Design a protein around this ligand. Structure first.
Ligand SMILES: *[C@@H]1O[C@H](CO)[C@@H](O[C@@H]2O[C@H](CO)[C@@H](O[C@@H]3O[C@H](CO[C@H]4O[C@H](CO)[C@@H](O)[C@H](O)[C@@H]4O[C@@H]4O[C@H](CO)[C@@H](O)[C@H](O)[C@H]4NC(C)=O)[C@@H](O)[C@H](O[C@H]4O[C@H](CO)[C@@H](O)[C@H](O)[C@@H]4O[C@@H]4O[C@H](CO)[C@@H](O[C@@H]5O[C@H](CO)[C@@H](O)[C@H](O)[C@@H]5O)[C@H](O)[C@H]4NC(C)=O)[C@@H]3O)[C@H](O)[C@H]2NC(C)=O)[C@H](O)[C@H]1NC(C)=O
Ligand SMILES: *[C@@H]1O[C@H](CO)[C@@H](O[C@@H]2O[C@H](CO)[C@@H](O[C@@H]3O[C@H](CO[C@H]4O[C@H](CO)[C@@H](O)[C@H](O)[C@@H]4O[C@@H]4O[C@H](CO)[C@@H](O)[C@H](O)[C@H]4NC(C)=O)[C@@H](O)[C@H](O[C@H]4O[C@H](CO)[C@@H](O)[C@H](O)[C@@H]4O[C@@H]4O[C@H](CO)[C@@H](O[C@H]5O[C@H](CO)[C@@H](O)[C@H](O)[C@@H]5O)[C@H](O)[C@H]4NC(C)=O)[C@@H]3O)[C@H](O)[C@H]2NC(C)=O)[C@H](O)[C@H]1NC(C)=O
Ligand SMILES: *[C@@H]1O[C@H](CO)[C@@H](O[C@@H]2O[C@H](CO)[C@@H](O[C@@H]3O[C@H](CO[C@@H]4O[C@H](CO)[C@@H](O)[C@H](O)[C@@H]4O[C@@H]4O[C@H](CO)[C@@H](O)[C@H](O)[C@H]4NC(C)=O)[C@@H](O)[C@H](O)[C@@H]3O)[C@H](O)[C@H]2NC(C)=O)[C@H](O)[C@H]1NC(C)=O
Ligand SMILES: *[C@@H]1O[C@H](CO)[C@@H](O[C@@H]2O[C@H](CO)[C@@H](O[C@H]3O[C@H](CO[C@H]4O[C@H](CO)[C@@H](O)[C@H](O)[C@@H]4O)[C@@H](O)[C@H](O[C@@H]4O[C@H](CO)[C@@H](O)[C@H](O)[C@@H]4O)[C@@H]3O)[C@H](O)[C@H]2NC(C)=O)[C@H](O)[C@H]1NC(C)=O
Length: 326
């Protein structure tokens, strides 16, 4: 007699019982696979005497989970919302994901886990360190702060801040490192030889107290006029009063700070300690002029050997300063 052959394999379906041939009268059942549905549901068929399976209209399609394309204050990555697809979640800047960062459309057509929600990152009010005060703080969310809000500490008078005055509200709802404020003391600064020092009239000097230095005529400071008590207990500097130099020649054109000057004119009131200058010398061979340097150090300046004075107009090809350069 005729038999029906092995039934067609339709997409996303199973057939029960599955055999390679059937006697007329035997029943098969097509079902959608878990996670699929079809217009009509299960199709049952009985092998007819002709041995021909009739037409099967079963169309098995994925279950569709509910629309999950919008995360308030964030983003969803998805292709479609159908079984068995995963969707991914993330939050805009300043929000955190309250829930799982992914979810799956299950064979039952619901999301697992449940869809998350985005919420504002918040820090509680910050603690004030000891001997610190709070300059810049205003809450931006009820009484709490929002992500990347800042607070600024300043120390009490006579206290140095170790660390940094500005804290930020982090992603972890806690603030960045607090700074410490300790009291710091400096010794009295030493009066320099050939000068004086002024600092405030009181028995101890603290962080940020200023001392100013002066020199007697004929001396200048070899460092800054004003110094301050630093966070490490020492002073910003300790300058000396150093001796000025007499102009070492009666008349000469020199280079000072990259320009030609008359040394008698530019330094009519002496040369300060530090003042550097270049004297002009003649190369007799190549009939041209070169410079050698000289510096005022604590009342002494060494004019180069090559320099020849009584410079008006005399020596062949005139003053070294007026001769063509080498
Ligand atoms: C706000 O709120 C937040 C929420 O919690 C807080 O955030 C936390 O920050 C703290 C740290 O302050 C975190 O805890 C700590 O985690 C440290 C890092 O762990 C990583 O490395 C571990 C190595 O064993 C490993 O177990 C982890 O897997 C982890 O690794 C990584 O994985 C990520 C991916 O997920 C990768 O991207 C990373 O690249 C990868 N990194 C690594 C290294 O693999 C941890 O070190 C720290 O331990 C200290 O404190 C413990 C206190 O009980 C103590 O038991 C530990 O021993 C340790 O201490 C020190 O010991 C270590 C050695 O174990 C010393 O280090 C070495 O010295 C060797 C010399 O012999 C040298 O050879 C080595 O090279 C090395 O230098 C170290 O010197 C010791 N230090 C001291 C002082 O003794 C701790 O467990 C916490 O997990 C964070 N949580 C969160 C949610 O963020 C935040 O703190 C809050 N903020 C404020 C301001 O309060
Ligand atoms: C910045 O952030 C800070 C910190 O959070 C914040 O400061 C907070 O500010 C709020 C308000 O300014 C303070 O709190 C609450 O104030 C209560 C006083 O008033 C009420 O009455 C007025 C009347 O005009 C009404 O208008 C108010 O709305 C309010 O009453 C309401 O009453 C109706 C009745 O019709 C209810 O329908 C409402 O639910 C109720 N509303 C509210 C909001 O409560 C004060 O009494 C409360 O105190 C509570 O909660 C405290 C939590 O810390 C707790 O310490 C207290 O002890 C007290 O809790 C009491 O708990 C008892 C048990 O432990 C309970 O016992 C009896 O009741 C039940 C019976 O069923 C049983 O438990 C028991 O058998 C017994 O009979 C008490 O009932 C219960 N008391 C109350 C009143 O419920 C609230 O504090 C905050 O205190 C304050 N927080 C801090 C830390 O300062 C600030 O506002 C923020 N800044 C900004 C700008 O936002
Ligand atoms: C205590 O420690 C703190 C933590 O380390 C210190 O804070 C840090 O300060 C430094 C410098 O002050 C910050 O870094 C620098 O950032 C520069 C990048 O700046 C940007 O410029 C881009 C243009 O090319 C913009 O597209 C960016 O938006 C950004 O912005 C602007 O910056 C302007 C000032 O320059 C400002 O006027 C604008 O309003 C602002 N605009 C915007 C949108 O931001 C780099 O060029 C530098 O090389 C360097 O990286 C550093 O970021 C900051 N720490 C953190 C976590 O942000 C703090 O200084 C210290 N306190 C003390 C007293 O030392
Ligand atoms: C006011 O206060 C303090 C004194 O209380 C002064 O601080 C001192 O300043 C010096 C330099 O400014 C610092 O010490 C050393 O710093 C550098 C770099 O140090 C780094 O590199 C070393 C490797 O050499 C390594 O350990 C670390 O990575 C470190 O960060 C060094 O090059 C140098 O180190 C040596 O100093 C020795 C003298 O003590 C010599 O024998 C060595 O040959 C070499 O020069 C340098 O000394 C410190 O910060 C600090 N020192 C101490 C002891 O406290 C501060 O300068 C002063 N200011 C004023 C204005 O008076």
């Amino acid at each position: 007699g005729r038999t029906c052959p092995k039934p067609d394999d339709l997409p996303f379906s199973t057939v029960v019982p599955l055999k390679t041939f059937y006697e007329p009268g035997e029943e098969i059942t097509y079902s959608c696979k878990p996670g699929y549905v079809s217009r009509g549901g299960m199709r049952k068929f009985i092998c007819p005497l002709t041995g021909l399976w009739p037409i099967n209209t079963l169309k098995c399609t994925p279950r569709v989970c509910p629309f999950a394309g919008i995360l308030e204050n964030g983003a969803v990555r998805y292709t479609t919302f159908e079984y068995p697809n995963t969707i991914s979640f993330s939050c805009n800047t300043g929000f955190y994901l309250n829930g799982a960062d992914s979810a799956k459309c299950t064979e039952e057509g619901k999301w697992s886990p449940e869809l998350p929600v985005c919420a504002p990152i918040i820090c509680p009010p910050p603690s004030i360190p000891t001997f610190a005060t709070l300059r810049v703080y205003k809450p931006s969310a009820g009484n709490n702060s929002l992500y990347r809000d800042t607070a600024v500490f300043e120390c009490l008078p006579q206290h140095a801040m170790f660390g940094n005055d500005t804290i930020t509200c982090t992603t972890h709802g806690n603030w960045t490192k607090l700074p410490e404020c300790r009291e710091v003391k400096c010794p009295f600064p030493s009066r320099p030889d050939n000068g004086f020092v002024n600092y405030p009239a009181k028995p101890t000097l603290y962080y940020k107290d200023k001392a100013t230095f002066g020199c007697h005529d004929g001396y200048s400071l070899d460092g800054p006029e004003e110094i301050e008590c630093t966070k490490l207990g020492n002073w910003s500097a300790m300058p000396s009063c150093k001796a000025s130099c007499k102009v070492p020649v009666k008349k000469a054109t020199v280079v000072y700070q990259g320009e030609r000057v008359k040394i008698q004119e530019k330094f009519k009131n002496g040369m300060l300690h530090g003042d550097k200058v270049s004297f002009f010398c003649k190369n007799k061979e190549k009939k041209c002029s070169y410079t050698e340097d000289a510096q005022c150090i604590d009342g002494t300046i060494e004019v180069p050997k090559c320099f020849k004075e009584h410079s008006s107009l005399a020596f062949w090809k005139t003053d070294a300063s007026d001769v063509k350069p080498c």
